[PDB]
Design a protein around this ligand. Structure first.
Ligand SMILES: *[C@@H]1O[C@H](CO)[C@@H](O[C@@H]2O[C@H](CO)[C@@H](O[C@@H]3O[C@H](CO[C@H]4O[C@H](CO)[C@@H](O)[C@H](O[C@H]5O[C@H](CO)[C@@H](O)[C@H](O)[C@@H]5O)[C@@H]4O)[C@@H](O)[C@H](O[C@H]4O[C@H](CO)[C@@H](O)[C@H](O)[C@@H]4O[C@H]4O[C@H](CO)[C@@H](O)[C@H](O)[C@@H]4O)[C@@H]3O)[C@H](O)[C@H]2NC(C)=O)[C@H](O)[C@H]1NC(C)=O
Ligand SMILES: *[C@@H]1O[C@H](CO)[C@@H](O[C@@H]2O[C@H](CO)[C@@H](O[C@@H]3O[C@H](CO[C@H]4O[C@H](CO)[C@@H](O)[C@H](O)[C@@H]4O)[C@@H](O)[C@H](O[C@H]4O[C@H](CO)[C@@H](O)[C@H](O)[C@@H]4O)[C@@H]3O)[C@H](O)[C@H]2NC(C)=O)[C@H](O)[C@H]1NC(C)=O
Ligand SMILES: *[C@@H]1O[C@H](CO)[C@@H](O[C@@H]2O[C@H](CO)[C@@H](O[C@@H]3O[C@H](CO)[C@@H](O)[C@H](O)[C@@H]3O)[C@H](O)[C@H]2NC(C)=O)[C@H](O)[C@H]1NC(C)=O
Ligand SMILES: CC(=O)[C@H]1CC[C@H]2[C@@H]3CC[C@H]4C[C@H](O)CC[C@]4(C)[C@H]3CC[C@]12C
Ligand SMILES: Cc1ccc(-c2nc3ccc(C)cn3c2CC(=O)N(C)C)cc1
Ligand SMILES: *[C@@H]1O[C@H](CO)[C@@H](O)[C@H](O)[C@H]1NC(C)=O
Ligand SMILES: CCCCCCCCCCCC
Ligand SMILES: CCCCCCCCCCCC
Ligand SMILES: CCCCCCCC
Ligand SMILES: CCCCCCCC
Ligand SMILES: CCCCCCCC
Ligand SMILES: CCCCCCCC
Ligand SMILES: CCCCCCCC
Ligand SMILES: CCCCCCCC
Lengths: 318, 16, 76, 99
């Protein structure tokens, strides 16, 4: 055919190991992304999964051809035959391309020398979540990538006009957060091997607390009301009062343990930890109130709900 | 040239 | 351990109360110890957390046996 | 285009007649392999498995006279796949369980 001869001519005398314009000028690469879906944000492991269609285009004077054919649209077969930039993701704990049924890669070659190379990736990017206030935490999770071995003088990156072709967010597995937006940056990081141009995409995610309300906040408020109801029970009922108080505080301890299990292992008190601590204070105070009463009730009947509501207002407004 | 001798030794070993 | 001591301010003639409080406190101490040790591997020696949990267990068990001693001195 | 052709000739000359089996200075003094590490993350230090997960940019440099070129005044950074055609130290971590 007329296309097979073009490919044979292009690959004839083609050094796959050499980048375009090596020793001449840095190779400008324009990268674009289609964020198919931001997968689950694993706050416990400080990582999140993202599925993308990563596209990168560059000019290669070796891959230029003049003929009636305008483009050479090719599958993954030709990806390994020509020079592809060694773009790796700096904050990817583990990433893998898609191979079923065939490798999910595309490669198009224009007459001038444009080489649009796209592939589908599933990156388990590392987002350094700072959950000092949880579950109201808002995170700007990045996704960096750069050439692994080619310094700034040999491979330069740049963002095409279309910033990021983010897909429809309805089908995303992002249950915890809501995708607020995207923002791109391009900075020259210095390291031991040289200076490398790094392009980073920050996805801004804002947490939703509805599941945490029905999961943690509501049970703790209900058990605090269970602590409250002890006051209306007659003071003479020593076993009843003591039983209600102990059941309340012990199940509060259990609820605190499971709520902390939801969180990762981090050494700082969070907002949920503050709320459960205040609930501890309330239930323990009710038990001690009956302890001192046996060894006043109406004052507690007012102070406990009012203190809890005022603390709720102060805590929630923050 | 210094390593060529061991290269020839290995090639002779793996030959046939 | 702090709430185990409130048994001491309760009236001596409250067996159903003090006994239940001490029992709940000691069983919760056991539960906390087991929950902490399950996360760690099957390590065959006592750790600092293990020794602190065991000390606090000895304290709460002593409070329960303090009520036992009071009941046996009054009734028995 | 002169530089591209010259670099292609230089790399082809270097790789031609190269024996991956023999280390640099084979049958001679030991090759000094300097090592450099840039830790990027320590993902998790687990006591249950008695292990820690560490991510790093493990770099190593050594002198190989067979890979010495002087026609061009620059440092040639090549495709990663050329590492399959060049001798590299058989470095391993005695502690690693899955890497
Ligand atoms: C230590 O040992 C381990 C194994 O114990 C080695 O790991 C193996 O390495 C080989 C060689 O590099 C890999 O084979 C390659 O696999 C490509 C697709 O792999 C996918 O499927 C396999 C299952 O078969 C999965 O295991 C892979 O997932 C794992 O690997 C990826 C990284 O690759 C990780 O990110 C994952 O997390 C997993 O760990 C993948 O899902 C396959 O395409 C490739 O074959 C192409 O390339 C060769 C090169 O010679 C060609 O001959 C061949 O024809 C193919 O080329 C066509 O396709 C490419 C696609 O782009 C086109 O560009 C070409 O033009 C052409 O059309 C190759 O077979 C193997 O996957 C990997 N893992 C195993 C076996 O589990 C380590 O390398 C080794 N060394 C070290 C230092 O660890
Ligand atoms: C291919 O790669 C090589 C190595 O990676 C590059 O060679 C390096 O080039 C840089 C460019 O400047 C050199 O940097 C500076 O070199 C000065 C020359 O010192 C020489 O002599 C002393 C004598 O003891 C040696 O110890 C030293 O290693 C050199 O051989 C140094 O004086 C400099 O020292 C300090 O400079 C700045 C000052 O602010 C500090 O910031 C630095 O951290 C450092 O402390 C500096 O080292 C470098 O030395 C070269 N290294 C080698 C091994 O040659 C080639 O340039 C590169 N080819 C290219 C880019 O085309
Ligand atoms: C993603 O990255 C791209 C490229 O870095 C960002 O697009 C760039 O945005 C700047 C500022 O808006 C543009 O500069 C301005 O261009 C206008 C129109 O020509 C001109 O009137 C201004 O004086 C200024 O020069 C820049 O042109 C544009 N890049 C391209 C290729 O057009 C984009 O904003 C980023 N997306 C984000 C941050 O969400
Ligand atoms: C007289 C008195 O003070 C009483 C009060 C409480 C009693 C203890 C309770 C637990 C018992 C377990 C086993 O039955 C062995 C004996 C055992 C340790 C008892 C010893 C005598 C005690 C201290
Ligand atoms: C920057 C960019 C933009 C689009 C692509 C792309 N190329 C294809 C080919 C096929 C299919 C199914 C999807 N492709 C997608 C992703 C897409 O557009 N979706 C999901 C609506 C790649 C890179
Ligand atoms: C391709 O052929 C056309 C017409 O023969 C010519 O004008 C053009 O310069 C050629 N391009 C090349 C050789 O790159
Ligand atoms: C007792 C009522 C508890 C809930 C109060 C919520 C107040 C609204 C805060 C919204 C953010 C400013
Ligand atoms: C083998 C180590 C012993 C573990 C238990 C220690 C208990 C000592 C504290 C008791 C305080 C009254
Ligand atoms: C969403 C948990 C707090 C609900 C308010 C309760 C005030 C008594
Ligand atoms: C929960 C509100 C009802 C109790 C108020 C009336 C008792 C004086
Ligand atoms: C040490 C626990 C609280 C004890 C309070 C008893 C009533 C004064
Ligand atoms: C005598 C106290 C009555 C309590 C009124 C309701 C407080 C929630
Ligand atoms: C091995 C020391 C045990 C200490 C026990 C304290 C009294 C029950
Ligand atoms: C502590 C147990 C032995 C002493 C009990 C009181 C006297 C019978």
């Amino acid at each position: 055919g007329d296309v097979t001869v073009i490919l044979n001519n292009l690959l004839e005398g083609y050094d796959n190991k050499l980048r375009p314009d090596i020793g001449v000028k840095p190779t400008l690469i324009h990268t674009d992304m289609y964020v198919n879906s931001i997968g689950p944000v694993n706050a416990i492991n400080m990582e999140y999964t993202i599925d993308i269609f990563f596209a990168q285009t560059w000019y290669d004077r070796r891959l230029k051809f003049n003929s009636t054919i305008k483009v050479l649209r090719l599958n993954s077969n030709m990806v390994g035959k020509i020079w592809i930039p060694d773009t790796f993701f700096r904050n990817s704990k583990k990433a893998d391309a898609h191979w079923i049924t065939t490798p999910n890669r595309m490669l198009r070659i224009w007459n001038d020398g444009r080489v649009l190379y796209t592939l589908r990736l599933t990156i388990d990017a590392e987002c350094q979540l700072q959950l000092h206030n949880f579950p109201m935490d808002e995170h700007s999770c990045p996704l960096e990538f750069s050439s692994y071995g080619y310094p700034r003088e040999e491979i330069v990156y740049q963002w095409k006009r279309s910033s990021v072709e983010v897909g429809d967010t309805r089908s995303w597995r992002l249950y915890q957060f809501s995708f607020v937006g995207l923002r791109n940056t391009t900075e020259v990081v210095k390291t031991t091997s040289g200076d490398y141009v790094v392009m980073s995409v920050y996805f801004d995610l804002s947490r939703r607390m509805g599941y945490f309300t029905i999961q943690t906040y509501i049970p703790c408020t209900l058990i605090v009301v269970l602590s409250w109801v002890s006051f209306w029970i007659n003071k003479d009922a020593v076993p009843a009062r003591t039983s209600l108080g102990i059941t309340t505080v012990l199940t509060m301890t259990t609820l605190s343990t499971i709520a902390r299990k939801s969180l990762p292992k981090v050494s700082y008190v969070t907002a949920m930890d503050l709320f459960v601590s205040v609930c501890f204070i309330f239930v323990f105070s009710a038990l001690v109130e009956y302890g001192t009463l046996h060894y006043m009730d109406s004052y507690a009947r007012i102070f406990f709900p009012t203190a809890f509501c005022l603390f709720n207002l102060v805590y929630w407004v923050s | 040239d210094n390593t060529t001798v061991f290269t020839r030794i290995l090639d002779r070993l793996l030959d046939g | 351990t702090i709430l185990s001591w409130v048994s001491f301010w309760i009236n001596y003639d409250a067996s159903a109360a003090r006994v239940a409080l001490g029992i709940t406190t000691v069983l919760t101490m056991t539960t906390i110890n087991t929950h902490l040790r399950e996360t760690l591997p099957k390590i065959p020696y006592v750790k600092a957390i293990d020794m602190y949990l065991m000390g606090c267990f000895v304290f709460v068990f002593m409070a329960l046996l303090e009520y036992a001693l009071v009941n046996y001195i009054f009734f028995g | 285009p002169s530089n591209m052709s010259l670099v292609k000739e230089t790399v082809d000359r270097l790789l031609k007649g190269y024996d991956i089996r023999l280390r640099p200075d084979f049958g001679g003094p030991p090759v000094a392999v300097g090592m450099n590490i840039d830790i990027a993350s320590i993902d998790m230090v687990s006591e249950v498995n008695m292990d820690y997960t560490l991510t790093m940019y493990f770099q190593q440099a050594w002198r190989d006279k067979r890979l010495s070129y002087n026609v061009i005044p620059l440092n040639l950074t090549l495709d990663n796949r050329v590492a399959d055609q060049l001798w590299v130290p058989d470095t391993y971590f005695l502690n690693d369980k899955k890497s």
